[PDB]
Each structure stands twice: as C-alpha cells, then as structure tokens.
Design a protein around this ligand. Structure first.
Ligand SMILES: *[C@@H]1O[C@H](CO)[C@@H](O[C@@H]2O[C@H](CO)[C@@H](O)[C@H](O)[C@H]2NC(C)=O)[C@H](O)[C@H]1NC(C)=O
Ligand code: NAG
Ligand code: NAG
Ligand code: NAG
Ligand code: NAG
Length: 915
C-alpha cells in the first residue's frame, strides 16, 4: 500500500486539475467582474425581515377579513330565509328547477364560459347543487331544501361582485346538497358526502377528548368484530387533529388496544396505529361493563397527559346487555361532565334497555348499526348532537374556524375552508324558540387557494434559499417549499419539513402561542433534492397574525438580507439565434397576466418574445420581474459572447451553462441543448441552491439507471455560486456550470491508479457518497449511484470513523400501495482533510487512506481491492426507503407542545338534551 505522502500528492494534483479546469471553463471570474463592473443597471435594496413579516401578516389578515365577512353574510341571509319558510309539501304543481352537476344531457344547459382563476368551465348565471349518489333525488325531504336554498344564489352573486377574488362558496346541509356558486360540472362511481368532510366537521362541533371502548366478548365473535373494526376505523377517520382520542378494549377487564396508555392526538400516525391495533383485536371472555367504564373514567380524568380541557366523551362500541351500572356512573359522573354515546352494532336479539339508558342519563345518544352502509350516516350524527351547547351559545358560536390545508374536491390545488353553522334561532323578544333549533341546518364555507396566499408572498425578491412559512397553534405548517401534494388533508409539522434541533423546537414552542421576535442560529440545512445536506446560518423573524390563530415567519440566510433591482434584449431571446447564443430556457413565472406559463419553454419562448416585442409600455403588466429578467438575459449573453465564444470546443468540457436569478440559461453548443434535463425555473433546480450555500465547488452526480441515456453523453455537472461585494455587503446572484466528458476524466485518471488489474481501488466520491470516478472500468459504466450500493463496508467504516454524519428526515408524501419515506443524506461533519485507518472484517485487513479535495466537496479513497478478501455486512442504500418512521409509542409520552382553543361550549345549564 503506497505511502500517505504519495496519496496526498496525487490528491493535490487531481484537485488542482479539476479546480483549475472548472474555474477556467465555467468563467466565474468574468461573470463576477461584469457584475462588479457595471454598478449602474442594478440597485441593491434592503430586505427587512420584520417589516416584510408584518406586511404579510396584515395582508393575510385582510384576506381573511374578506372570507369571514362573506361567510357571516351568507349565513345571516340563510337564517333569515329558512326562518320565514312555508315548508311547502305538495311540490307537484310547483316544479322546482335547479342545475344539478355530474348529470348528463341525455333526455339548464349553460354556455359554460371559461374564465381565469378557474381551470374549467364555470357559469356565474346559476348555482350548482351536488347531491350524494346514494341519497334520493326530488322528494319531500330534498325539494324543500332545494327551494329554500334558491335565495342563496343572490347572496353568492353579491359576494362575488363585491369581491372578484373569491374562489369558492358552498353550503352543506343535514342531507348533503352542496350548493356551490360558480356552477361547474363535477369530476366526470364517485363518493362524496358533504357531511363527511373536515370542513363540515370542524364547524359542526367542538374540540373533544373522545374515548373509545369496544365490547370484545367471545360470544359476539364473528362478523360483528369486522363491523366494529370498520366502524371504529371510520370514527378515527372522522377525528380531526384538534381532538384527542384513545381506544381501549374490555373483557372482564379493560386494557389498551394499542401501545398508547392515554389520550393521544388524532393525527395521521396515531390514527393509523389505532386502526392497526383494532384490526389486530380478537374476542375472548365475558363482558363486565363496570370496570371498563371505571377505567375509561380515570382515563377521562387523566390530567397527567396533554389534553384540550374541552368536550370529554365516551364512545362505547357494544351490542346489548342487562347491566346499567348506575353506581359506576354516579361515583365518577355526578355533575355529569362526560357524555356517553352507546352503539348497538350488528343484527341480534339482546336487550337494549341499559344501552339506551347509558346515553339517556349521560347526555349522550344511542345508535344502531344493522349492516354495512349506515356507518357513514350514523357517524355524522353525534357531532350534531354535540352542537347543542354550541347552538345554545347564541352570539358566541358566531366565530369562523379556518381548516388546515387539504386537497380541493374539483382539483383546484391546495386550499383551506372557512366554517360557520346555521341555526333556526328567531324572535328573541318572544322566545317561542328553545325547540328543534337544537339541530343545525348544516354549515357553509368559502375557500382560499394556497396560490392566493402565495400571491401575497413575494418569494422572487428573495434568494432561492429564503422562503415563507406560517404555522397554526396545533403546530403544522400552512405554507412551506417542501409542502407538496401527493395526488385527505396534507399535514406537515414545522419539524417535519426542515431538520430538527433544540432552537427550532424552542421557536416552534415560542411563537405557536403567538409571540414575536428574532433569532439567528447556526445549524445545518437541506437541499432541494433529497440527496445532499448542507450547513449555514439562518435567521428567523416571526410575528403573530392578530386576526386569526395562525402565526407567520420568514427566513433569511445571511446573504439574502439584501437583494437586487433594476433602474427603470430582443435578439438574445430568439430561437433562430441559438446557433451562436446557445439553447436558451426562460423560467415560466407569472411575468405577465396576459400570457400563461407553457412549460414547453420553446413555445413559452415564442410567446414571451412576441409579447415583449409588441408601444412596449404594456399598460397592464408587471414591472420589476420583467426588468430583472431582461437584465439577467443581457448578462448571460454578455458572458457567452465574451468568453465562451473564444473556446468553441474543449476536449474535456462537453458543455457549459449558467443559470441565474431571473430564469435565463445558456448552453453554448447546439448539441448540448437536448442534453439539458432540468427545470427551467431557476428557483426549483437543486444545484442552484446547493452551490449558493456551499462556499466550495459542487459536483452534482448524474442519476443512475435513469430512463433515457443521460450519463455517457451528458457528462458530470460542476457548479460554483457567484458571490459579489458591492460596498462590502454580500449577495449571491448566479451560479455557473460545466459538463465534463467521462472519457476525458477516465483517460486523465489513468496517469498512479492504472486499470485492467484487480489489486487496489481508486474512487472519488462527493458529499452523499455518490460515485464520480473509478478505475475498474466496470464501475465507470455505473457512474452516479450511491457508493454504498457497490462498496457498503467502506462507507460504513467511514461513517463509524466519523467522516460521514447522516441524519434522517421523514417525508409523509409518497406514492405507495400514505407511507413514510426515510430520507437519508450524508455530509462531512469533521473538518479534517486527512483520514487513515485499517478496514478489517476479520483476519483479512485492508489499509486505506482517504484525503479530501481542497475547495470542493470531493473525497478520494485509496483502498485495496475487494478481491483480496470478500466482505459484505449488508447492502447500504441511500434512497427513498419505504419504512415505518419514528415509533409513536415513544413520542406520545413527550409530544410536541400544543396550545388549544380557548373557545368551548359545553355543560350549558339551559341545554335540554331530552334524548
Ligand atoms: C329549523 O329547522 C327545522 C327543520 O325542518 C324546522 O322544523 C320544521 O318545523 C315546521 C314547523 O311548521 C314543521 O312543519 C316541519 O315538519 C319541521 N321539519 C321536520 C323535519 O319535521 C324548524 O321549524 C326550524 N325552526 C324554525 C324557527 O322555523
Ligand atoms: C377584502 O375586502 C376589501 C373590501 O371590499 C376588498 O377591496 C379587498 O380587495 C379584499 N381583499 C383583500 C386582500 O384585502
Ligand atoms: C317555494 O315554495 C313557495 C311556496 O311557499 C313557492 O311560491 C315558490 O315559488 C317555491 N320556489 C321556487 C323556486 O319555485
Ligand atoms: C443531524 O446530524 C447531527 C450529526 O450527525 C446529529 O447530531 C443530529 O442529531 C442530527 N439531527 C437530527 C434532527 O437528527
Ligand atoms: C412547443 O410547442 C411548439 C409548437 O409548434 C413545438 O414545435 C415544440 O416542439 C414544443 N416544445 C416542447 C418542449 O413542448
């Protein structure tokens, strides 16, 4: 094995060659020199974090003022209209006419004029009614609703006309009947119950400490167990994240069905765990209600755990019996703080008297489930039963509640919904009320798209590493870069998108209560692509949103504290000029409302240049965005004309490129244009951000086993961010790039580590353990894969000796047959350039010396061949591994710190609760 000095000399020579070639061919010096030479065409302006967060908070509060005023208006007029309703029965003569969606033209037929802000056909003349497929059409229980909701369309018209930015307006009733205003055909045996939706549920009840008990007696084993499992699973589905639920089973003794021994939050992971636990249940023993309910009661009074002190409930899943257990209820529940809802599931002939008495005495309700199908309807009922204190609150239940981000029904994007319920309370001066008013007519809601929220968020004046994020008092994120749809509400915690520490949890527990401040901390950050980790200083500025429960914050790496502007060409952005200017891509952003994104990019180029070409004033068009993009295109053209033209063809350099802020890309030769595979949006490509954060050269490895050839003829991507100093103040405008022919690198790698023999291994890796160069001539075919997938022993020993530190993220968005993805990414932790040791699997030992490449992220390892002694502990894989995330059995006993809503309505003295 060669000496350490020889390996150091080889590393120095290789790193000098690579660095020099990348620097000379990419042309960082010329670009930065141009940027520092003009100082005229651009303006550097401060990006005030606290000011921006305040402006965004007030703006979003105003948009919520819009969408709450609309809702109070619609609800008030709904109450007024139904209050003075005849309840016409004989609708034979009075044929009511309405526009039913999802219908067919086989014997209203609107022209269906398509407008912006909606992807599909809309008609503002009429409103569209959605009814569940299972429920029946025109009858004595739907036609009345279809009549008295015919006056809601006027309010819809008025609301839209007074505010043209409204997205959607819906009203949900006790029998479905979603009447949504911008009448659009439905999806295209579709299942959608309006009452079975988070926005319906969150408005129709209060945050509840639900408990579940299941009758698991051996005598009722069979189909009843399956019905119980499916019913309780659908119950858990009904539970939102504002409620705490736990399931226990009792058979002469009560025990937890799962690893949880207390009330846990009803989030997706816990809900799945409870569902799986109940699905694993089996029936054995004799029933004893007393000890079951007792246990449920100290679980209710279990104040040692996290709870929303609000709306305590028991939900018993029984069949029938002759045991009322008066004394058990009397001992624990004398003031009657706990509701008890009991079920009679299955078809049997047991006595149901005590079962009904339990609900009757404890202010709960009793339900029967004779067969599959009635579970969906029966589940909605207890929520409306819980609304009795809420309906009797009067001028206190009038408070809109904003849902979390969830996918819209007609495929519009990420949206949240407002909620308000409608009552029949009327005539306060006489009070013929205190009646049927107990029940609600349903809930009505408006929608705001996350595109609308992000229109209030100007991200393009920041760096790609900066962004916005807002968090609700539960703890999840309302808006985040990593918040991406999968196709169910999307749920990302603040410490589930970013990387966890003590400072981030401290600030997520310091602004979730609704405080403000600033804090700069030194941590490690994550790249756009799930392959690399990085490190940098980020400052977080946060302020509460006074109008709502939300809390927004802003992030700034300490080089995007300032930004760039432009004070106050055509030939550059011409496809026919690509022969000399290179195959340009333009970033499909909202440059102008007149044009649209194309993704095509070629067409987008035609549209962009035809709009820019023709007076060029553009009276209804953006100003700063187009100005910056023009200036940046000028810069890219200047670079290509001055430097890249001089050396038309380099043996080792397959291509060159420069991506910038503004969205202009330049690949010098024509043939390399079709080799370009990445996103034209410069805020979306990973390497842009990675290079800005790393102060060294960044070698992006190509993908391995990717569809279509992209390794041999594409080359190796190298980058280095451009940093400028105007008046001693930092900014990171652009990054440059090169494609390195693999053949040239191979031929120059044979100068030391000669090939065609199996004696020693010479491989060059980067951050993340991706193979870039190898001598074996069979590893060089497979360039671009994770190095642990070919030599896992070496990577594991490298991890143990602490040259590669990894921490795993858990991303909950995946395509699987809502799996959790284990996101492993590696990086250098110990800033030690030299590393040596012996890799021994037993008697056989291999001497290795690993020396890092200076001013890059590459590592060269000089280890013996695998033929000397076989050793493979396990094939270590770095990819999106499908596996269970962190165990919730341990994270519920020390969960994330929550703040609950102070607004609750329960234990009302005026409450009737006759049933
Ligand atoms: C609030 O809603 C209920 C639901 O319809 C109304 O109950 C109806 O009351 C009328 C009174 O004449 C009866 O004719 C109907 O038969 C009732 N409905 C049902 C389903 O039986 C109630 O009247 C409403 N409250 C007010 C103040 O009108
Ligand atoms: C909110 O309401 C006002 C009053 O009509 C309206 O002009 C405004 O555009 C709405 N939206 C926002 C974001 O303020
Ligand atoms: C609803 O019923 C009333 C009778 O109270 C009738 O006059 C009215 O026209 C009906 N509405 C529609 C849309 O026809
Ligand atoms: C990130 O990696 C460091 C070093 O390996 C480790 O100390 C830290 O706990 C990791 N962070 C997370 C959130 O796992
Ligand atoms: C864009 O549309 C034009 C229309 O003629 C077509 O020629 C071109 O190939 C398209 N490019 C892409 C990438 O879709």
């Amino acid at each position: 094995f060669p000496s350490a000095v020889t390996i150091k000399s080889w590393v120095d020579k290789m790193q000098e060659d690579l660095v020099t070639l990348a620097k000379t061919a990419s042309g960082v010096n010329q670009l930065v020199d141009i940027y520092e030479k003009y100082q005229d065409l651009y303006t550097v302006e401060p990006n005030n974090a606290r000011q921006l967060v305040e402006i965004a908070a007030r703006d979003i509060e105003k948009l919520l003022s819009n969408r709450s005023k609309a809702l109070v208006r619609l609800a008030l007029e709904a109450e007024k209209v139904q209050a003075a309703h005849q309840w016409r029965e004989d609708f034979a003569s009075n044929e009511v006419v309405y526009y039913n969606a999802k219908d067919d033209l086989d014997p209203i037929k609107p022209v269906f004029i398509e407008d912006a802000n909606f992807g599909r056909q809309i008609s503002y003349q009429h409103a569209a009614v959605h009814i569940p497929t299972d429920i029946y059409e025109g009858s004595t229980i739907v036609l009345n609703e279809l009549n008295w909701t015919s006056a809601l369309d006027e309010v819809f018209k008025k609301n839209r006309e007074e505010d043209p930015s409204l997205l959607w307006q819906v009203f949900g009733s006790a029998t479905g009947l979603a009447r949504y205003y911008p009448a659009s055909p439905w999806v295209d045996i579709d299942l959608y119950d309006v009452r079975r939706r988070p926005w319906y549920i969150q408005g129709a009840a209060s945050p509840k400490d639900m408990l579940i008990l299941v009758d698991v007696s051996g005598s009722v084993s069979g189909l009843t167990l399956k019905l119980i499992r499916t019913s309780v699973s659908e119950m858990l589905e009904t539970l939102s994240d504002d409620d705490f639920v736990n399931v226990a089973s009792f058979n002469s003794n009560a025990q937890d069905v799962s690893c949880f021994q207390h009330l846990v939050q009803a989030n997706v992971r816990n809900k799945k765990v409870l569902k799986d636990a109940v699905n694993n249940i089996t029936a054995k023993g004799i029933t004893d209600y007393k000890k079951g309910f007792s246990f449920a009661f100290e679980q209710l009074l279990n104040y040692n755990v996290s709870r929303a002190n609000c709306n305590k409930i028991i939900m018993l899943f029984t069949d029938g019996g002759e045991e009322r257990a008066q004394e058990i209820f009397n001992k624990y529940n004398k003031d009657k703080k706990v509701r008890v809802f009991t079920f009679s599931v299955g078809q049997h002939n047991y006595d149901r008297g005590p079962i009904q008495w339990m609900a009757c005495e404890n202010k709960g309700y009793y339900y029967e489930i004779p067969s599959i199908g009635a579970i969906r309807i029966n589940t909605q009922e207890y929520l409306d039963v819980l609304g009795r204190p809420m309906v009797l609150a009067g001028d206190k239940a009038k408070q809109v509640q904003w849902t979390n981000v969830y996918l819209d029904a007609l495929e519009l994007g990420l949206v949240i919904t407002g909620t308000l319920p409608v009552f029949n309370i009327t005539g306060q001066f006489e009070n013929k009320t205190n009646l049927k008013n107990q029940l609600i007519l349903g809930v009505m809601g408006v929608d705001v798209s996350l595109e609308d929220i992000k229109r209030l968020t100007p991200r393009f004046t920041l760096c790609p590493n900066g962004y916005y994020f807002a968090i609700d008092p539960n703890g999840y994120v309302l808006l985040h870069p990593n918040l991406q749809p999968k196709n169910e509400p999307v749920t990302l915690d603040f410490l589930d998108a970013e990387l966890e520490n003590d400072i981030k949890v401290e600030i997520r527990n310091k602004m979730i209560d609704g405080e403000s401040g600033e804090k700069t901390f030194r941590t490690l950050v994550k790249s756009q692509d799930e392959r690399y980790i990085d490190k940098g200083n980020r400052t977080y500025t946060w302020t509460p949103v006074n109008g709502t429960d939300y809390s927004l914050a802003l992030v700034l790496p300490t080089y995007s504290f300032y930004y760039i502007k432009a004070k106050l060409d055509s030939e550059t952005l011409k496809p026919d000029n690509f022969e000399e200017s290179g195959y340009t891509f333009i970033a499909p952003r909202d440059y102008c409302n007149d044009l649209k994104i194309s993704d095509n990019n070629t067409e987008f180029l035609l549209n962009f240049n035809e709009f820019i070409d023709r007076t060029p004033n553009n009276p209804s068009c953006n100003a700063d965005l187009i100005n910056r993009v023009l200036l940046d295109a000028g810069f890219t053209n200047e670079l290509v004309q001055n430097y890249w033209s001089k050396q038309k063809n380099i043996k080792g350099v397959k291509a060159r490129f420069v991506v910038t802020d503004g969205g202009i890309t330049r690949v010098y030769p024509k043939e390399a244009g079709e080799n370009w595979q990445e996103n034209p949006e410069t805020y979306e490509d990973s390497f842009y951000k990675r290079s800005l954060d790393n102060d060294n050269y960044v070698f992006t490895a190509p993908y391995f086993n990717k569809s279509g050839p992209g390794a041999y003829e594409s080359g190796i991507m190298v980058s280095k961010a451009v940093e400028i100093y105007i008046q001693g103040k930092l900014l990171k405008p652009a990054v440059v790039g090169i494609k390195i022919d693999v053949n040239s690198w191979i031929e120059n790698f044979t100068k030391d580590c000669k090939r065609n023999s199996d004696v020693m291994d010479c491989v060059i890796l980067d951050d993340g353990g991706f193979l870039l160069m190898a001598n074996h001539d069979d590893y060089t075919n497979q360039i671009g894969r994770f190095f642990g997938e070919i030599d896992p022993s070496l990577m594991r020993h490298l991890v143990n000796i602490s040259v590669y530190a990894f921490n795993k993220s858990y991303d909950y968005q995946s395509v699987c047959e809502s799996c959790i993805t284990e996101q492993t990414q590696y990086f250098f932790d110990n800033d030690s350039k030299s590393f040596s040791g012996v890799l021994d699997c037993g008697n056989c030992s291999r001497i290795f010396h690993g020396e890092k490449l200076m001013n890059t992220n590459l590592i060269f390892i000089m280890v013996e061949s695998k033929g000397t002694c076989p050793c493979d502990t396990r094939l270590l894989i770095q990819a999106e591994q499908t596996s269970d995330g962190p165990n919730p059995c341990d994270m519920v006993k020390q969960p994330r710190y929550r703040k609950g809503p102070d607004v609750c309505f329960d234990n009302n003295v005026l409450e009737d609760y006759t049933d």
